[PDB]
Structure 1
Amino acid sequence: GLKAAQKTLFPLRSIDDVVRLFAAELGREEPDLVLLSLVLGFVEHFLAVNRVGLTYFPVADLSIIAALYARFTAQIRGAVDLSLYPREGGVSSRELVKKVSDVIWNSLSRSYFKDRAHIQSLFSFITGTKLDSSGVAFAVVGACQALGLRDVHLALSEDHAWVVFGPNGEQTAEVTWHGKGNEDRRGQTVNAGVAERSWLYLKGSYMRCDRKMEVAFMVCAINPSIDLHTDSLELLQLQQKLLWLLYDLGHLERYPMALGNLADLEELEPTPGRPDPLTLYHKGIASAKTYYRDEHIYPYMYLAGYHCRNRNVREALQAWADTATVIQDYNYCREDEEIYKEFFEVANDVIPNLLKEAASLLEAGSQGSALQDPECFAHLLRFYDGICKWEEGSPTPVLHVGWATFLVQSLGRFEGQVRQKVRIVSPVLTFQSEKMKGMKELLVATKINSSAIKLQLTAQSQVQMK
C-alpha cells in the first residue's frame, strides 16, 4: 500500500523489531517484498556501510521507510503502463516482464563495480542506483508484485537468477546479466541452458520461489561484512534470527542453501535449543534430494567446508566425493566457471593443505588418521572420478596438467599399503569415468608413477621428443 496494518510496528528500534516486521509480513496474504528489502537495506547500510554515529541500532522511522517505498513505487508505476499489456488469465505476458526488467536495468548507474558488497537491496537501487546481478532479478520481482502481477516469481540456480511467470507459472524469462563478458539474454527463456545440461540451469531442477522463498532469498542476501576482517555482529544476529523465523514457518523446506547459511551462522554463534550445524547441513542435503533430484552442489560443499574447518578429514573427503557424484551428470558449459572454480580450489588448494597437515600429524603419531584409512583414499578417488565423468561429453574440457601435480601429490599422501586395500570393481569402489578406470593400474604402486598419471589424467598423447 503501504497499508495501515503494515505501518503499526514502526519505528523499528532493534533487531527484534525487524524480526517482528518480518513475522507480521510473513503472516500476511503476501509479504511485501519492497517494504522488506528497503528495511533490510536501510539497516545494513547503517550497520555495515556507514556506522558513524551508531550507538545501538539504526532506528528505522516510518517516515523514512515510507518515503523510500514511495520513490520505488512512483518509479515503477510511472514507467510501466499496465494498460499497454492486458493480462489474460490473471497472468502476465513476456512483454510485460521484459518491460519491467528494462525499467530496472535502465535506472542503473552507467559504470560501477558489479561485484561489490551491499548493492543487493532496493535500498541500494533507490539511494545508489546500483544493483548486483541477482539484485536486478529480485527487484524485477518486487516491482511486479508492486504492480499486482501475482504470477511473477524469482527463479534461482546456484549461480544465477531469473523469473517464472505466465500460465501455470510455466514460462521463464531472463531479466538480468550473468557473469562478466557474457552477452545478455534478457527476455529469452532458459530452455537452451536446461537442454544443454549445464550446471548454471541445474537440468531444470532450479528453485521456483513462492513469495515466502523470495523473503528467504533477501534474508540470505544480507551481507554482514563491514570489511575483509570484520563482520557486523548486529547483522549476523539479524540474519540468523530471520532464518530461524523462516525455518520455523516452513519456508526453508525447499531452500537448501539457506539451510547451509543458517548452519554456518550456528557454527559461528550457536543458538541454545536449536539443531547443531551438522544437522542443518544434512537437512540442506535432504532438501536437495527431496525437491531437486539431488542435482545441487552447494549442499555438499557447505557440509565439506564445515568438516574441513573442524579438521574432520574423513567426512570432508566424503562430502567432496559427494559433490563430484552430483557434478558427474552435468556437461561443463560456458558460463559454468564458478563451479569449475570451486572444484579447482578444492582439488588443488584445500585438499592438499588438509592432507599436508594430516601427514604432519601422522608423523607425530596420530591414530585413526584418514591417511591410514582406505575408505578415505576411496573418497579421494571418487572425487576425481566424478570430475573426470563431468568432463565426458562436455563441450569444453575440465582437466589439464595443472591438476595433475596435485593429484600425484594427494595420492602419495597415502601409503601404498593403505592404497592397496581399496578394491576397484567393474573398501570397494566403482569408477564411472574412463579416465579413472585406466588409472586403476597405477593407484597401488609404492611409488606412484607420476608421468603415467599425468598422461592418463590429461589424456596427453605424447612425451617429450628429446
Structure 2
Amino acid sequence: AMGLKAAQKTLFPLRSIDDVVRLFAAELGREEPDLVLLSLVLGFVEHFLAVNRVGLTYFPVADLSIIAALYARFTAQIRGAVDLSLYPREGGVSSRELVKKVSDVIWNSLSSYFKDRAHIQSLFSFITGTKLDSSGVAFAVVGACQALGLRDVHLALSEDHAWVVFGPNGEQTAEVTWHGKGNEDRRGQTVNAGVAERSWLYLKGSYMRCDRKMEVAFMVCAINPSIDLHTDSLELLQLQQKLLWLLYDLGHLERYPMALGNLADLEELEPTPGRPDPLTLYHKGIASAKTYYRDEHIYPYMYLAGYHCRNRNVREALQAWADTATVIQDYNYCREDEEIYKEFFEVANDVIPNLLKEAASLLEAGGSALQDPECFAHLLRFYDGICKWEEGSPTPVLHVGWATFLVQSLGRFEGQVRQKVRIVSGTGPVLTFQSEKMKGMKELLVATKINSSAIKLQLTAQ
C-alpha cells in the first residue's frame, strides 16, 4: 500500500532466495501486499543475478537502504505529480480522469530504447533507468495507483496484452501501454472495441481481472531468468518456482491458468518432492480456464501440448493441439492477433511435421501412432479448427505454405489407418467437421492415394 513498515523492514537484509520468499510470504498475508516493494526487490535480485559469473554460489544482497531509497524515489515521484484534491473520489471509485493522469505520469517518465529487451519489466528498471517493457508499464501504473490509495485500480491481462481496470467490480477499463509494433496508440481508451471484435487479443472479454494477490502472481511470472541466448539463471528459476508454490498454496493461482502452466514447466525442469506432477498442474490450468474463463484461452492447451511433444506422447500432443484449434475457431482473426497466428503456424508447418517424421523414422526402423486412427482424427480436428477460424476473418490465414505440410502429414498415415475414421459434416473414431473447406475434402482425406494438387487448392481457396 503506502510506505515501508517495520514488519517488512525487519526481514532485511535479503541474503538468499529463501529470504526473498519469506518477504513475499509476509506480504501475501496482508490485505494490500506492497507491489512497489516486491517489484523493486525482484528487479534488484534479477538485475544482479542475470549475468554470467565465476563462483559456484552467489546472491546479491538486497540491503534495506538501497530498496528503501528506490522506494522513496518512486513514491515521491508519484505523490508530487498527482494532486488527489483535484480528483474527487465518489464512492471508493477512481475517475477515468484520475486513472489517465497516473498513466501519463508513468508514460511521460520513460526514456528512446529497444522496448523488447530483457530485464526491463520491474519497477527497479523504471526507477534506475526509466525503461519498461510493454506490460511493465501497465504494472507500473497499477503500482502507482496503489501508492496513491486507489484500491479499485487493478491489472487486467489477456494472453498477449495488459491494461487496467477500475470502478465497481472493475467495470471500467483503460489502455495504459502499447501493443505490438506500429499499431496506433489506444492509451486512454476502453478495451470494449477489442472485446466487441471477437479478437483473440481481448479473449472475447474472458480476460483476467487481478486482485492485489494476483498482481503479485503476475510479477512472479514476469521474472526473466534468461542471461543470454544459451543460458538461464538457476537461482532465478528456483526463486520463481518457490514463489509460484507459495502463491499456489494460498490459492492465488486458482484463476491464473498461465501461472499454473509456468509452474508445471518449472516442475518438469526440476520436480519438487511431494508436489503434484506437471501433468496434474497442466490439467489444473485447463480446469481453471474452463471454470473462470469460459474455456476461451489458448495457452492452457498449448502448455499441455508442448509437454506431450517433449515427452514424445504423439497422440496426446496431437489431441491437445486439436483442442487449441477447437478454441480458436470461435474467434475472428484480427489486426493484432499475430502472436497466436505465429504459434499455430509453427505447430502446423514445423512441430507436427517433425513429430511425424520422427515417428516415420521410428517405424522404418521396426505399435506406432501413425497406425492409430485416433491420431489421424486429432490431426483432422486441428486443421478443421483453423479453417473455421479463418472463416469470417479478413486476413488470409491459410496459404500455399500451409498447403504442403498438410498433405505431407496426411501421407504419414496409410489408407487402411485413415479409412477407419468416419467423417461427418457438421450441419473406429467418429469426427464431425465444422468448416467449409474441410467439409469439402471429406472423402479426399481417406482415399488409398492422396489427391495432392486437389487438397492443395481446396485449402488455399478464397
Q: Deviations over 1:353-395 (max 9, x none)?
A: 1110010001112xx2110000000000000000001111113
C-alpha distance in structure 1 between counterparts of 2:435 and 2:67, whole Å: 56
Shift of 1:114: 1.2
C-alpha distance in structure 2 between counterparts of 1:275 and 1:54, whole Å: 30
Answer yes or no: is the 8 Å Cα contact 1:153–1:210 preserved in 2: yes
Answer yes or no: is the 8 Å Cα contact 1:263–1:281 preserved in 2: yes
C-alpha distance in structure 2 between counterparts of 1:329 and 1:168, whole Å: 27
Q: Deviations over 1:21-43 (max 9, x none)?
A: 00000001210000000000000
Residue 382 (1) aligns with residue 381 (2): yes
C-alpha distance in structure 1 between counterparts of 2:125 and 2:55, whole Å: 20
Secondary structure at 1:425 match in 2: strand
Gaps of 5+ in 2: none
Secondary structure at 1:65 match in 2: helix
Secondary structure at 1:200 match in 2: helix
Shift of 1:50: 7.1
Q: Mean Cα displacement is larger for which, 248-257 or 410-419?
A: 410-419
Secondary structure at 1:49 match in 2: coil
Q: Deviations over 1:104-144 (max 9, x none)?
A: 111111x1111111011000111121110000000000000
Q: Deviations over 1:298-351 (max 9, x none)?
A: 000000000111111010000000000000000000100000000001001111
Shift of 1:425: 1.7
Shift of 1:55: 4.7
Q: Deviations over 1:32-69 (max 9, x none)?
A: 00000000000000100475889521111100100010
Secondary structure at 1:410 match in 2: helix
Q: Mean Cα displacement is larger for which, 390-399 or 231-240?
A: 390-399
Secondary structure at 2:173 match in 1: strand
C-alpha distance in structure 2 between counterparts of 1:309 and 1:69, whole Å: 43
Secondary structure at 1:130 match in 2: coil
Secondary structure at 1:356 match in 2: helix
Q: What does residue 82 of structure 1 align with?
A: 84
C-alpha distance in structure 2 between counterparts of 1:291 and 1:177, whole Å: 27
C-alpha distance in structure 1 between counterparts of 2:151 and 2:337, whole Å: 31
Q: Mean Cα displacement is larger for which, 91-100 or 140-149?
A: 91-100
Q: What does residue 31 of structure 2 align with?
A: 29
Query: In 2 relative to 1, CA 53–69 (structure 1 residues): closer, same or farther, beyond 3 Å?
Result: farther
Q: Mean Cα displacement is larger for which, 444-453 or 213-222?
A: 444-453
Q: Deviations over 1:210-236 (max 9, x none)?
A: 000000000000001111111111000
C-alpha distance in structure 2 between counterparts of 1:31 and 1:81, whole Å: 24
Gaps of 5+ in 1: 460-465
Percent identity (aligned): 100
Answer yes or no: is the 8 Å Cα contact 1:46–1:54 preserved in 2: no
Shift of 1:80: 1.3
Answer yes or no: is the 8 Å Cα contact 1:174–1:189 preserved in 2: yes
Q: Deviations over 1:254-276 (max 9, x none)?
A: 00000000000000000000000
Shift of 1:446: 2.3
C-alpha distance in structure 1 between counterparts of 2:448 and 2:400, whole Å: 22
Answer yes or no: is the 8 Å Cα contact 1:322–1:383 preserved in 2: yes
C-alpha distance in structure 2 between counterparts of 1:52 and 1:341, whole Å: 38
Shift of 1:4: 1.8
Answer yes or no: is the 8 Å Cα contact 1:263–1:276 preserved in 2: yes
Q: Mean Cα displacement is larger for which, 78-87 or 20-29?
A: 78-87
Secondary structure at 2:455 match in 1: helix
C-alpha distance in structure 2 between counterparts of 1:287 and 1:269, whole Å: 23
C-alpha distance in structure 1 between counterparts of 2:412 and 2:56, whole Å: 52
Q: Mean Cα displacement is larger for which, 42-51 or 211-220?
A: 42-51
Q: Mean Cα displacement is larger for which, 290-299 or 123-132?
A: 123-132
Answer yes or no: is the 8 Å Cα contact 1:30–1:211 preserved in 2: yes
Answer yes or no: is the 8 Å Cα contact 2:206–2:294 preserved in 1: yes
C-alpha distance in structure 2 between counterparts of 1:53 and 1:330, whole Å: 51
Shift of 1:151: 0.1
Residue 3 (1) aligns with residue 5 (2): yes
Query: In 2 relative to 1, CA 128–321 (structure 1 residues): closer, same or farther, beyond 3 Å?
Result: same
Query: In 2 relative to 1, CA 55–273 (structure 1 residues): closer, same or farther, beyond 3 Å?
Result: closer
TM-score if structure 2 supplies the norm length? 0.97
Shift of 1:397: 2.2
Secondary structure at 2:294 match in 1: coil
Answer yes or no: is the 8 Å Cα contact 1:141–1:153 preserved in 2: yes
Q: Deviations over 1:431-463 (max 9, x none)?
A: 01111000112101222111101111011xxxx
4+ residue stretches of structure 1 with deviation over 4 A?
49-55
Answer yes or no: is the 8 Å Cα contact 1:153–1:165 preserved in 2: yes
Q: What does residue 42 of structure 1 align with?
A: 44
CA RMSD, 1 decimal:
1.5
Answer yes or no: is the 8 Å Cα contact 1:9–1:17 preserved in 2: yes
Q: Mean Cα displacement is larger for which, 4-13 or 295-304?
A: 4-13
Secondary structure at 1:213 match in 2: helix
Shift of 1:167: 2.9
Shift of 1:252: 0.2
Answer yes or no: is the 8 Å Cα contact 2:170–2:209 preserved in 1: no
C-alpha distance in structure 2 between counterparts of 1:144 and 1:293, whole Å: 30
Q: Deviations over 1:167-199 (max 9, x none)?
A: 332001001000000011001001011011000
Answer yes or no: is the 8 Å Cα contact 1:49–1:118 preserved in 2: no
Shift of 1:245: 0.1
C-alpha distance in structure 1 between counterparts of 2:16 and 2:458, whole Å: 60
C-alpha distance in structure 1 between counterparts of 2:246 and 2:353, whole Å: 39
Shift of 1:150: 0.2
